[PDB]
Write a protein that binds this ligand. Sequence first.
Ligand SMILES: COc1cc(NC(=O)N2CCC(n3c(=O)[nH]c4c(Br)cccc43)CC2)ccc1C
Ligand code: NI
Length: 313
Amino acid sequence: HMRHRTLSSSPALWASIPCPRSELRLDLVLASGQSFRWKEQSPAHWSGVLADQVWTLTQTEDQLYCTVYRGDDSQVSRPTLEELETLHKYFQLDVSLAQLYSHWASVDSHFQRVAQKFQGVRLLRQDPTECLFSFICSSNNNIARITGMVERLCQAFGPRLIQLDDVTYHGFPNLHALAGPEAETHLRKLGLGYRARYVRASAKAILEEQGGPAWLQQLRVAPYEEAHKALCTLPGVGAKVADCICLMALDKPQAVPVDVHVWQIAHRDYGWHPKTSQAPSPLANKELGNFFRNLWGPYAGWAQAVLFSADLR
Ligand SMILES: COc1cc(NC(=O)N2CCC(n3c(=O)[nH]c4c(Br)cccc43)CC2)ccc1C
Ligand code: NI
């Protein structure tokens, strides 16, 4: 009945935000392994679900064009002031990426070279719950396989929002839905494997041990290291997944998620070797995070995303 919108098809239902290409590149950000909920359903048109609503996003050289599908058989219209504020916070456009790029480049010759082609790579401000369970699914996994597990998980547990063409869109499920006695068995049938246990276990833990989603909001205003330790008490959440959530959901820009991916970049592109440590290891991984924080500064996590986006593309 209802189809995916393009800026040419139905320009009446679109709204713009003043945003240069230097500050944001949809094609780089929405497929850099930050969110796993956006798909380029038509060329230069990125469709995904955001806070129990579906969006389609496209851009020019100095404008970010966006349209909303409410889904509750409502009168179709342009995005509101509040819904545009939601998108502004989501891309964290209040922060100048140009000034950060220059600041990182001043102390890093390697970043300077990569910063040429790969501009407008910024960090999304994600829902802690969506981010947490998405990055529990990320362990020893590729972007395409993670995107599969998260899509299936949302269709099975999350509430249906709308159908556009052949794609049925579901919002991310609440903690109670993932904590049920059937949850792990269902999730294994959806192909999560060993990750199915950590999803149910972490959902049950946040509810019983930590007192629901308000905890993840407490970690948002808590300092980085208090938040990191707190997340590491959850089933299937270590330093890597804890740093990812910290960087991408809990506003900890100095959070540098360290696994084999940054290790490769650290060694090949920076000639880094563990100085204080003997032998990858928990101690060596922490040293590597401190190395990048010492080099790039309090937005070290944002810098890593630019090199990550560069290594993926
Ligand atoms: C862009 O900003 C960030 C993204 C992440 N995401 C992440 O670490 N993962 C785990 C592996 C996935 N992945 C993969 O499958 N191959 C990859 C190659 Br090659 C490079 C980087 C990631 C790759 C994507 C989800 C972590 C931190 C930052 C700042
Ligand atoms: Ni070497």
